Amino acid sequence: MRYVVGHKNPDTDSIASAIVLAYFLDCYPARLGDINPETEFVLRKFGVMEPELIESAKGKEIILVDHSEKSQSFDDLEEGKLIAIIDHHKVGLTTTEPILYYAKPVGSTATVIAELYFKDAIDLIGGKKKELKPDLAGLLLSAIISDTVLFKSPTTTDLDKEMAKKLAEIAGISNIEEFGMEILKAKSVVGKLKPEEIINMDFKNFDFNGKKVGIGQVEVIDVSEVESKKEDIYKLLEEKLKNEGYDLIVFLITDIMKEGSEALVVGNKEMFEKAFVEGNSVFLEGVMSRKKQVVPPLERAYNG
């Protein structure tokens, strides 16, 4: 009756935070979509099973992790009962009743959970005060690394590193740098998938001043792979744009090594141009984080 769920097109933070929190809250973990390769890698590595799929909150109690935007959560959230939101994004969700809300401007939701655990404050968000086994500690570690892109992303903070170090200990990972590289590789395999799989792997929806806007992403070590599919990708996006009523779609081809992204712009390029473009896209040096470096200047332009 009570579930912990991350956002649609869940990433590692959403799956790991849901699983670990469900453990401390003594309820059910779940996912609002399929898990990507990087997550499949981690769950398999630490021996944790994939959470059950959930698509409707109707008649259920829900704890949301890693997001606060209706567009990224249940469509029928109102028909269920929101219990809590543990996140690290800007406040985007409004509620009708008091809920347990805990957000911090850090690198991942796992970082937030972990800090509460080591600080002996898990009970502050309903946690039962149980031990954090190495398998779960491995999930949280992977979430931090996944979310911060091995501490290279500008959303990375001191708390993120400090927590990674501690979790790495309980998890038994001696070389975070190397384990992290393994994670960055699993993240990269997305490039070998079909264009449709690539776009729907990590796409997020936003509502900037009434205009539906989507921002997808791909994070690879070597962009060569995705670039050969770029044309087909950009094509499927133009279709998605018109067929699903988007006013704009930004697709980030993030090069992990150059720490910058090629931003494919679909739809209202004017707004994009006003927010930050020769033809297909443009490269944005140093841009890696959607939430930190792309959503803000974009929302600022739609309601300004």
Place this chain on the structure above:
Amino acid sequence: MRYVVGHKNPDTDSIASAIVLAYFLDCYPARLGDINPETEFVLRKFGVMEPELIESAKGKEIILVDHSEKSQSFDDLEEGKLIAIIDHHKVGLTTTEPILYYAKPVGSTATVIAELYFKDAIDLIGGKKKELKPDLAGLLLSAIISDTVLFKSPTTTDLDKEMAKKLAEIAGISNIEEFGMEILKAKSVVGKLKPEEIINMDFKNFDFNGKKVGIGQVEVIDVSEVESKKEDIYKLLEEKLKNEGYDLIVFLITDIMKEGSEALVVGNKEMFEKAFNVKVEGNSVFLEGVMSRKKQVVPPLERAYNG
């Protein structure tokens, strides 16, 4: 600079939480409105000075306590630098960037702060591990009692009681029940005030799916005097409705002993009747067991509006 501020038409929770958190965060305490009789009583009691009054957030770093609603905060909140929100109400504010946000559905903001304090985790929200002196412990205590209406309100949780007992110990308050009776008599004096004062003393404004709704409230031990002003109060609420463009206004005459509220309904009566599965006879209705605005009135009403 950095300020910790409560909401417009401040109650004791808003004042105490602003002062105490400011003390822990080492910044300036402040208020968005005038202090009510109950708070004046509580402040004088623990020898604590009244927080400075401010009105504009422009150029200020803000930390909001006890509220998450634009229409209850600075008119220019946006022009300020929102640092954090420590509350116990529903989420009503969206932010432009990640922020420290900590809200628990307990009886008061004071409860949240105290729980962080005793767990030695005040640093989780920026605290500086300072010691809670008896005077400030007394304010938190007063805030809890005030917000829960002496643990009578359904927002009251075990945490609220647990925290109250520990705070009473520090503040040197041997009998919480007796002190609470005083606080309850303090809320009641509002009933003695003129209609206009009773209306503005604890009026909250909201945005429900684009609609401007107002929910005021008065809590008394003997409602008879407020009832003798009910008529005049209603007229004023009718004027407030059309002049300030409210889609709906509800004023709760809360009977502390019967633990219920007589709701005065102005404007969109239909939406109200829908919200509470009850048709209104006249311009008001008594809601049995209803004492909490945030837990019993806002939820069904905002759900009706956007639903």
